[PDB]
From a paper:
In a previous study, we reported the three-dimensional structure of [name] and defined a molecular fingerprint of conserved residues that define the family of broad-spectrum racemases. Compared to Ala-R, [name]’s capacity to accommodate amino acid substrates other than Ala capitalizes on its broader entry channel and active site. We discovered that contrary to [name] alanine racemase AlrV highly compacted active site, [name]’s is broader and can be occupied by cell wall stem peptides. Using a [name]-His variant, we observed that the hexahistidine affinity tag was fully stabilized in [name]’s entry channel. Based on these data, we proposed that [name] might interact with the cell wall muropeptides. Using in vitro biochemical and structural analyses, we demonstrated that peptidoglycan peptide moieties bind and inhibit [name] activity. Interestingly, edited muropeptides containing NCDAAs (produced by [name]) showed stronger binding and inhibitory properties compared to those ending in D-Ala (canonical muropeptides), suggesting that [name] activity is controlled via a negative feedback loop by the degree of NCDAA cell wall editing. Taking these biochemical and structural data together, we propose that inhibition of [name] by peptidoglycan peptides underlies a negative regulatory mechanism to avoid excessive NCDAA production.
Residue numbers in the entry:
A (entry chain B): 24 to 411
B (entry chain A): 24 to 409
């Protein structure tokens, strides 16, 4: 992950100078947050999950919306993300949503992150860090009832139950949450695992002398929060749905568009090869649009000969394999095309839209594999509507 | 591409806040350059291709080696790369290796970059920038004899020949180079296309009254420069081989390693699922290492259940699909593993090394698709040897 998130938000002139860029819909982000809220019980808390620089969309540009919406909690992964959140002015709860090395945890003390622990050694290390900083560190205990086998403590054996109690009883540590996380989008499975979570959490709080009123129980990602409402418990952890990436719930549109421009228009006769490996050959006299985007910007090699882009409101086929920095598109039968026109790689342009399913099928990736790396490799520009 | 290439190099204290990172071998970079030089004829010169922030390795940390090696030319793609090159002190020839929009070209006038043009409109646009800026702009004409069908002008028809002449006869412009580029690692196909490029270049210079002695003819990427030496001409354009990514010439080792650390060690009983979509189930009581790297750092989802990583000098299997920020590894039978230990995702650790072929097979990508995005998504630390 990046060691620091660019403090400045790119402006319009910087956009006219960029080869490729992301346009982030602040209005769509707001609408998605408000729609999500409509399905939450009133006193269920919301922890907005902002890991991977807000799912590629950019923590610094989105935090004013999180604050304006009165969201009490934010989740992050890296120390740089935690720093960006605090530099926004956010004074709410800040949690880490993954296991983090002692190196990482120790260097983050001034950011007041609530760490996520699932092993005795993590508990011992944080207890020592607490005694060294003269603080009481706040932690969430990850349990494995959801079956992620990732950050949590599995309690299906005697040894695991004993380790869980040892995690929960360390000195100079404040257990503020107990959580799990689910691996699949199956409501019957989540209901069965939620019941086990209630049993394991109850048992752990009893064995460790914890006070129910001081613990936040939380298990729900976006899917679970919306499709299994009894799992909302004390707090929910939506990420993807806020950004408009929840496949089960298409009523939250994506907030991101990926764009480039037409650099140049090239006339090619019939029987001309295009791209590395000569994987495409023109069958007719052609006009090709040369775009200054490639796989180094996050537009994969596999898009070639499969994907379409939007130019001047029309779909145009990507031909030849994508190069590191350049993509070639067949505009022979596209009217009105000129150098400098905007090209949509993902998103909408006029009435046409490149769907998430197209991206996934063409790239052979899941959508977040694309957009998280779009966000590290291109500037983000924020759009918001207002009344005139 | 990034709008700005961070000016500061991460320091030693910064690596403790890093979840994952790249280590760049400056010594390996130097030895790749010196080995490449040994195969170049006396009359050619080198233009080091440093697009995509030096193939993910970082322009700012590698430019001192480029200057120490006396390299006279550098190629870039983005304006941010051109700016980083000039800010490093490089005072040689600077070329762009792709077509660039008018707004990009206009923004770059202060950097003294030689643009690459293959259409009449590009020539017209640059001529107007020359008039508006009060200077004569230097350009390279891209020809399509190699068959890339990308940035060049095809001259197999009368229309193409006439457009090529128009490109080369624009006033307020100085044609300093004529080039093409090859799409395949077939030496016999390259030789045939090289002969055609000589014909087409020679015809264009005659018809546009250009003086051969003032024009740099250049056609060779890494592969071509090493495997078709008669194609070296006045200048070569190596990129990948300098960084140790030329599949045909495995004698240039990669300069990049991708690393993380063990965050935690988890005991999971037999018949336990791991990861999203529960694609893995333990077959024995296990000890799993939790690593704070995932696909948002450029370690793809497809690595799960296929790849191995190196921990404490031993290979360990990645189990379950790779999450956005976390990877889980089976260390049940790996001895000596502790939290905080370094993990090699790509590169060498002790005697074992994770090969480029493993990355490509496991990720279902070509190697540069991985490393260019590693470089935008992780800090780079520069290893120097006395
Ligand atoms: C532990 C944890 N909770 C919540 C989330 C958010 O998940 P989603 O994007 O499916 O809502 C993630 C990310 C996660 O790893
Ligand atoms: C026009 C051009 N020349 C040279 C290179 C360098 O290619 P390679 O990495 O195969 O040496 C590239 C990149 C390119 O696009
Ligand atoms: Cl988890
Ligand atoms: Cl080309």
């Amino acid at each position: 992950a990046p060691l620091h998130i660019d403090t400045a938000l790119p402006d319009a002139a910087q956009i006219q100078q960029s080869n490729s860029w992301l346009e982030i819909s602040l209005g769509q982000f707001q609408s998605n947050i408000e729609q999500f809220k409509s399905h939450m019980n009133a006193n269920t808390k919301i922890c907005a999950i902002m890991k991977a620089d807000a799912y590629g969309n950019g923590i610094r540009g989105l935090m004013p919306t999180i604050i304006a919406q009165g969201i009490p909690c934010v989740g992050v992964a890296s120390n740089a993300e935690a720093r960006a959140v605090r530099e926004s002015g956010f004074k709410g709860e800040l949690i880490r949503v993954r296991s983090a090395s002692l190196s990482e945890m120790s260097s983050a003390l001034d950011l007041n992150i609530e760490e996520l622990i699932g092993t005795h050694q993590q508990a011992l290390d944080l207890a020592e860090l607490a005694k060294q900083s003269g603080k009481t560190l706040k932690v969430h205990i990850a349990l494995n009832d959801g079956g992620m086998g990732r950050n949590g403590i599995d309690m299906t054996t005697e040894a695991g139950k004993k380790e869980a109690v040892s995690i929960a009883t360390q000195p100079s540590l404040s257990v503020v949450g107990i959580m799990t996380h689910f691996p699949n989008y199956n409501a019957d499975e989540v209901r069965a695992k939620l019941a086990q979570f209630k049993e394991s959490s109850t048992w752990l709080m009893q064995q460790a002398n914890l006070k129910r009123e001081e613990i936040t129980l939380h298990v729900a990602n976006s899917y679970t929060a919306l499709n299994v409402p009894e799992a909302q418990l004390d707090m929910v952890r939506p990420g993807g749905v806020l950004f408009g990436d929840l496949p089960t719930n298409p009523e939250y549109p994506s907030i991101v568009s990926f764009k480039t421009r037409v650099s140049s228009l090239h006339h090619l006769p019939k029987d001309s090869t295009v791209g590395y490996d000569s994987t495409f050959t023109t069958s007719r006299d052609s006009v090709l649009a040369n775009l200054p985007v490639g796989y180094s910007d996050g537009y994969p090699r596999k898009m070639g000969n499969k994907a379409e882009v939007l130019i001047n409101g029309q779909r145009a086929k990507v031909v030849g394999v994508t190069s590191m920095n350049t993509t070639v598109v067949d505009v022979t039968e596209i009217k009105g095309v000129l150098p400098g026109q905007e090209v949509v790689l993902f998103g909408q342009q006029q009435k046409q839209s490149i769907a998430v399913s197209e991206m996934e099928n063409n790239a052979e990736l899941i959508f977040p594999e694309l957009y998280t790396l779009w966000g590290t490799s291109n500037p983000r520009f924020y759009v918001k509507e207002n009344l005139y």
